[PDB]
Design a protein around this nucleic acid. Structure first.
Lengths: 431, 431
DNA sequence: TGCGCAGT
DNA sequence: TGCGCAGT
């Protein structure tokens, strides 16, 4: 019981001092953490054979529910993958808005001794846990509420109700079982706030339930303004970039940064962290790290204005400068970067699909995707701010963020790079 | 028989030396120009009572066809206006693409002694012929082809066929009669090229039939490149402005200026002439000239980039600096403005609706509106260029065009101007 | 799939 | 009305 329960995944090919205190998926599903009865795996991509092999032998026949958003042929492929294992069910989360994804990454782990909730950033495929920087939040072991005891099991941060609303929004019968399981467990120790996105169009007070308006509300109610508030940068850090509009006022600096700079009841610097071509080239994977950084040329050339916000991936602090980011984080550092007002780890990349965007003249928040993250607020630990670990929050990358040099360019996955070979002597030719 | 047959309308309140050689509608429908049998009036707005009173008493019972594009209630109002006059029919030109207008202004004037075609810029309402600068082209009197003579009646410029294709595109039975009438007349003297727009989506070689691609083709085939071609500005001059896109490369400088700078088989300066607020304020009409310059704030604030092309209305040359422009013109002056490579007078304002814009990756030219204009090419008079009248072409405004001062702003019809009174002591409050 | 857009 | 748009 350190306060944050924030971990990185294990990286192959770094010194083992950068992997001590890091978690592989195998560690997470270990018998150490409890005697497993069943599980639910919420994700975007699955390699089903690999996933089963991550569970310990004693636990491989226990019911697994996969919660995915694939349709049609993808769906049929995933069903086919799952066919060999009788213990495995599937739940297709409904995606009624186009270009939506079931992007949330979460494990519900039901044990004989209680319940664990893991919220993280990694797809259920080998490459996502191999040589990338990913983030993980581990809930405590939530004990079961005794049969005749009447308690809510709720925390000051309202995690239990907030999780249940997130699950309730799917409308899925196989998730009813998980909702009932959460109901019977005591989640009162939880010291983080849940930030979910769910697909839809939301009006009035429901705008606050999801996406970046949910973050805004949490910050309004549970953080407080700082003297010189103006000067506390916002830092966003992500692996995919959506179509953000013709200029910054369309969404980024207008409705996204607004929500993010809220504190209690604008020239706030915005630093955006996204790997350069050069970062990808010299990575542990080389150019094929690029396959998980899907910023397409067509999107990029609409929005060249964006790339002057862009800063290098740099992670000397966690030995992970060459372990390309699939983690997404957002945070509110002080101007000197020695402390932070809050920290969010989430599945949500820098997209309107993920965070939400306003339609019909401000009356309506549209969200295409399922997302999930956890907000770390000083107030939930009786503090005003966290010191950055150089009590103190473990920021996985270096501060302050360093601006792309003038020869740098963002990684764009679907053009060739044939001038300089990568780490493994290779070029990149999408095809 | 001066070569151009290009006239301005009569302006009330200027010295009569600026109205000698100018034409009122009454002059155009005069018995002087022939003994009228019937007529067709192509236009956008009609005041039917006023129009009938423009025809001489002897000619008021002769068949008039009105060719309009009104639907629904507008249509019913125009039908009601026309009700009292048994000699008057109507033809509704089909407008299958939204935000299209039947904007063409043309009179077909059938006489006992032959046929006249008038192509011009004025709506058939009193205010359009009162104190505005408008343009008129008068065809010669085309004699009838004798019954057993076999001649085409065509000109070197292909006017007759080109007019007939324009009329044929309406698909209107009441226009069949006019097509047959044009067929029986000799139009061989015509020394101008017809430039039409008609509504639709046009592919392949049909892209060249209409709008700005029609202008491009004419310029390719019948003008020739100039030494220093690069440096001959393009001048556009209009009374309405459409939505041209988020920046200049979207249409204006990409496909519109391209068509306009074509000469035979880019840093070409583009000068756009459009009345400032100050031009409208001190006009003969004052702020109500604004009612015919319908550039709305919503369109303007999307495209502030445009307004650095904007130049004042100035017309000392024709005594018409205070007679606000409803004429539209485009032309190709030399760098010193002493001569021009060509001149176009037309109904088409600075809009994609009018000129056309490419859809589906360059394969398709979409046009919303009916338009019509006449192109004056030196080659059709055996010349290489026209000297500007200061043989020589009568440019109705001053050269070179003068840039908006830094306190000037474009006229925008639907915001208030309440700081400085106009010519008649009034303010402007749309409402 | 449904939003936002487009005249004189 | 029909075009262009929008994910990881």
């Amino acid at each position: 019981g350190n306060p944050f329960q924030f971990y990185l995944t294990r990286v192959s090919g770094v010194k083992p001092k950068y992997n001590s205190g890091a978690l592989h998926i195998k560690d997470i599903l270990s018998p150490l953490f409890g005697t497993l009865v069943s599980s639910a795996q919420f994700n975007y991509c699955f390699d089903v054979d690999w996933l089963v092999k991550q569970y310990p032998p004693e636990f491989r026949k226990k019911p697994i529910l996969l919660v995915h958003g694939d349709k049609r042929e993808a769906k049929a492929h995933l069903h086919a993958q799952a066919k060999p294992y009788e213990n495995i069910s599937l739940c297709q989360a409904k995606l009624d808005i186009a270009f939506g994804t079931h992007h949330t990454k979460m494990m519900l782990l039901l044990y004989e001794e209680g319940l664990r909730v893991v919220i993280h950033t990694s797809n259920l495929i080998h490459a996502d846990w191999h040589q990338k920087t990913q983030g993980i939040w581990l809930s405590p072991l939530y004990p079961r509420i005794a049969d005749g005891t009447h308690k809510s099991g709720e925390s000051p941060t309202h995690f239990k109700a907030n999780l249940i609303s997130y699950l309730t929004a799917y409308n899925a019968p196989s998730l009813k079982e998980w909702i009932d399981v959460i109901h019977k467990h005591d989640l009162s120790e939880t010291n983080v706030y849940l930030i979910g996105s769910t697909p839809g169009r939301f009006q009035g007070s429901q705008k606050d339930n999801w996406g970046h308006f949910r973050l805004k509300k949490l910050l309004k109610d549970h953080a407080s303004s700082m003297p010189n508030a103006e000067s506390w940068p916002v830092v966003g850090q992500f692996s995919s970039v959506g179509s953000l509009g013709a200029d910054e006022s369309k969404w980024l600096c207008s409705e996204f940064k607004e929500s993010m700079l809220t504190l209690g009841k604008s020239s706030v610097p915005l630093y955006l962290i996204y790997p350069s071509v050069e970062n990808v080239r010299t990575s542990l994977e080389g150019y094929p790290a690029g396959g998980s950084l899907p910023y397409s040329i067509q999107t990029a050339e609409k929005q060249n204005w964006l790339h002057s916000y862009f800063h290098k991936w740099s992670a000397e602090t966690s030995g992970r400068s060459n372990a390309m980011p699939h983690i997404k984080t957002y945070m509110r550092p002080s101007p000197d970067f020695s402390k932070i007002a809050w920290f969010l780890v989430t599945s949500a990349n820098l997209s309107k699909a993920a965070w939400g965007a306003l339609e019909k003249n401000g009356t309506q928040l549209m969200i295409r995707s399922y997302e999930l993250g956890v907000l770390f607020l000083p107030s939930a630990l009786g503090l005003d701010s966290f010191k950055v670990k150089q009590a103190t929050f473990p920021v996985p990358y270096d501060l302050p963020p360093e601006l792309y040099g003038s020869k740098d360019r963002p990684w764009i996955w679907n053009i060739p790079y044939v001038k300089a070979p990568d780490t493994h002597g290779n070029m990149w030719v999408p095809s």
